[PDB]
Amino acid sequence: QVQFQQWGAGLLKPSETLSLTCGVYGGSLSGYYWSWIRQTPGKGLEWIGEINHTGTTNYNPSLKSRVTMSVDTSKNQFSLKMSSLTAADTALYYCAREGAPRWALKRPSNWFDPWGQGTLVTVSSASTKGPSVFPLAPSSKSTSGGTAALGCLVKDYFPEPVTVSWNSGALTSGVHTFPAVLQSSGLYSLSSVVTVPSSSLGTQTYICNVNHKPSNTKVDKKVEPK
């Protein structure tokens, strides 16, 4: 029943001030400690800090110089502020509650039980850039026994994420959308592929739909054989 809604800007420059807030539904803040936990994509979990309904806070010692937390009991919300940001602060940020009640000072903490969803926060000096969508055409060298592979390369965009569909979602089987890679440039590049019957080439249309909200970009790229 207890769940979270999170908001706060997710794209910042270094040395800006990150501010995130979670509203709590289905349960009150009073009696519990509430924490922020972050996770770099591909990495593990790092606890940031916790606050109770009276404002008692506890922070990770490796972050206490640039992290504060607030609570708004009238709105049943709590907030995190993080300063002197760097690219290393790019991560998914979660709200969580302790699994059991605990008053303002109890030396050993509890476990986390209800976790909220992870919101991506990106810290970079790069400015928002829409992706270039390049076709990956089926050929002689992308066929194998009646099966032809085609796709699209979503290159030089920032920041994450991008959503990729095939034929506006009517095409799903055999689709592989790959995690993006961060280039030296600070821009992202991803690919989406699909294997189809090679007899379908010439009559069946294959279009890749790429949506990048931060740049307000949506591209419908038709992929045609050789």
Add this chain to the structure above:
Amino acid sequence: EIVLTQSPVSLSLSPGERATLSCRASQSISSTYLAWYQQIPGQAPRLLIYGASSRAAGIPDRFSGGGSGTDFTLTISRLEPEDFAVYYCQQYGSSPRSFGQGTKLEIKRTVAAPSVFIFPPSDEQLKSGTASVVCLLNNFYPREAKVQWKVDNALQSGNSQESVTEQDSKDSTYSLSSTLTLSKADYEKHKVYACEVTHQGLSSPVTKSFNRGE
């Protein structure tokens, strides 16, 4: 800081088998201050066990926890398809609360050779002054595979990036995409572009190549 070292890093098993994951703390901690969380890629962590052995509501009895002092264990008696995810350990006896680096529980299936495809750069990218060549490895197992880019038989280094998808939900295979990026001058300076794939399922490396002006 209490460091938590999880073991092993990766674990390939099949549904119906027994899994046991270890959590070692750099210092001795009481069992009441240990927890285990499960995480499927793309979703938030989910509480499995707290206080070393207590199961959170909804968690079946096939999940067991124990240990004391410096060493703790999570045991999945008979593995179900739902159970294949990442597993993290956590201590909350000492500030700050620390997590282990995780253990990945992957479905163990039959060796499958990849289907290797190659894609030259499009004309749209060529007018941008850049050329990217793509090589696709489709539906293979296990995850370990080697991709090598060769331009006129010159092995490439520092000019390519690859990405691997999560383990597929129905055939438990992996797929990999590799991108080789050159300037369009460097790209037009050469003729033969090749992707060489090494994998457990192939009796010899498989090369997919093309020529500029095909």
